[PDB]
Ligand binder design. Structure first.
Ligand SMILES: *[C@@H]1O[C@H](CO)[C@@H](O)[C@H](O)[C@H]1NC(C)=O
Ligand SMILES: *[C@@H]1O[C@H](CO)[C@@H](O)[C@H](O)[C@H]1NC(C)=O
Ligand SMILES: *[C@@H]1O[C@H](CO)[C@@H](O)[C@H](O)[C@H]1NC(C)=O
Ligand SMILES: *[C@@H]1O[C@H](CO)[C@@H](O)[C@H](O)[C@H]1NC(C)=O
Lengths: 18, 21, 119, 232, 49
């Protein structure tokens, strides 16, 4: 078993926020 | 002292007495 | 999958079967035919089906150590969305690979000036 | 090719309703609305006139044959045996249900979107309102882009009035719209040139009148708040 | 950005979709909610001031 840690975030939606 | 302190229809109106005054 | 050789080139999806094959050059995707999809270190892939749309997210990151997932933050850019509308309860991989199930969560996302999700 | 769906020689069963997806084509809903053949043209979340100008990401057509009485059951948030199992409409599906008399030609039945006695063919249209490049667009004519001036802009079915300026935003390719804290869209990508344009609201300011007492004089001075003299 | 019960929180959308008779209903919901939001804001400022 390998810990997920912080890996795996993806952009939720097309709209751009800065 | 001054260093330490930090659209739609909303608008901010300038104070009558400027900081210099 | 943390492989430089990238032997893995297949992804089988089934309860209609969704076959995604990297093959050569453009990736070719078969949902057979109810529909046909036009041809399009560590590799990170997120697979989810929402409303009959299959959104894939892919990021490639060089790894100092193959054994352990790199400590740090990675943002996965969406690659392709397919309106296949096929129910998938099982999946298989065609030639280490780590599989993690996705659970709904509330996330606070930090966006930089560039707009990347820094954290 | 709406004609194919509407004039389809063979119609699907009510319970076994079929869904055909219409995409990548300009769609004119006026023709359908004009045709009197359709006994009912009720639109639940949209108005027929607006249909011509609105641009939808995807259009889904459901074809089934039901008795005249059964037509009412289809309606969203209505309890009918046909609606109970055969075909279910989710509330606020933002689509138009179109039914036409088909008894002459006709003369098997048994979760939302999950699959007197004369039978009438019924086709249900569902409109996708998600924010994505919209494959289906109504008949419209594009006009040349204008920048650095207040302009009323309709982009891919999005209407707003604001100044348009070139945007230095590093828009990601998948991204189509940039939004501020408010729902209003700060930045838009051109449907024809794929350029990122910033939107700035047209200058608005309070008008104040400086008046000496009316008795003393009637002359007045006018102040425009936070408005440059050049603008006005 | 709150719907307050309306189909959408973007006024232009409602105007660009529903016909005048129906739109009124949706708009009224938004007006009521937005109006209430201002009063709350104003009241707090008075007390705070
Ligand atoms: C954005 O990316 C550029 C490189 O294109 C980099 O120089 C800059 O520091 C980045 N800014 C942020 C806020 O990430
Ligand atoms: C079906 O055929 C009729 C023939 O009179 C035609 O008028 C109509 O346009 C066709 N249906 C559609 C949706 O175009
Ligand atoms: C049509 O759109 C493409 C980009 O999608 C653009 O390159 C082309 O110039 C457009 N044609 C016209 C006539 O505007
Ligand atoms: C108004 O615009 C002029 C440029 O023509 C500029 O010099 C001036 O500072 C502006 N006034 C402001 C920003 O109050």
């Amino acid at each position: 078993y390998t810990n997920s840690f912080t890996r795996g975030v993806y952009y939720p939606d097309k709209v751009f926020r800065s | 002292l001054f260093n330490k302190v930090t659209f739609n229809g909303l608008t901010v109106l300038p104070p009558l007495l400027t900081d210099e005054m | 999958s943390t492989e430089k050789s990238n032997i893995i080139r297949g992804w089988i999806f089934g309860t209609q079967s969704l076959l995604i094959v990297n093959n050569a050059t453009n990736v070719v995707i078969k949902v057979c035919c109810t529909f046909e999809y036009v041809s399009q270190n560590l590799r990170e892939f997120v697979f989810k089906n929402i409303d009959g749309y299959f959104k894939i997210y892919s990021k490639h990151t060089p790894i100092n150590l193959v054994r352990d997932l790199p400590q740090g933050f990675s943002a996965l850019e969406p690659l392709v969305d397919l309106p296949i509308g096929i129910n998938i309860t099982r999946f298989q991989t065609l030639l280490a690979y780590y599989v993690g199930y996705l659970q709904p969560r509330t996330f606070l996302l930090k966006y930089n000036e560039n707009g990347t999700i820094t954290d | 090719p709406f004609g194919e769906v509407f004039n389809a020689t063979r119609f699907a069963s009510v319970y076994a309703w079929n869904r055909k997806r219409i995409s990548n084509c300009v769609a004119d809903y006026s023709v359908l609305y004009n045709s009197a053949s359709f006994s009912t043209f009720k639109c639940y979340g949209v108005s027929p006139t607006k249909l011509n100008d609105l641009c939808f990401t995807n259009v889904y057509a459901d074809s089934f044959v039901i008795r005249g009485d059964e037509v009412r059951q289809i309606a969203p948030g209505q309890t009918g045996k046909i609606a109970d199992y055969n075909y279910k409409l989710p509330d606020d599906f933002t689509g138009c249900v179109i039914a036409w008399n088909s008894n002459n030609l006709d003369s098997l039945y048994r979760k939302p979107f999950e699959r007197g006695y004369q039978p009438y063919r019924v086709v249900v249209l569902s409109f996708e309102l998600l924010h994505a490049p919209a494959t289906v667009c109504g008949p419209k004519k594009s006009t040349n882009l204008v920048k650095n001036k207040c302009v009323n802009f309709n982009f891919n079915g999005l209407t707003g009035t604001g100044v348009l300026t070139e945007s230095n935003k590093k828009f990601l390719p998948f991204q189509q719209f940039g939004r501020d804290i408010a729902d209003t869209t700060d930045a838009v990508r051109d449907p024809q040139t794929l350029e990122i344009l910033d939107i700035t609201p047209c200058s608005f300011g309070g008008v104040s009148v400086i008046t000496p007492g009316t008795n003393t004089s009637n002359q007045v001075a006018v102040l425009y708040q936070d408005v440059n003299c050049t603008e006005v | 950005s709150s719907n307050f019960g309306a189909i959408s929180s973007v006024l232009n959308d409602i105007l660009s979709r529903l016909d005048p008779p129906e739109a009124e209903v949706q708009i009224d919901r938004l007006i009521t909610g937005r109006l209430q939001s201002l009063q709350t804001y104003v009241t707090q400022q008075l007390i705070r001031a």
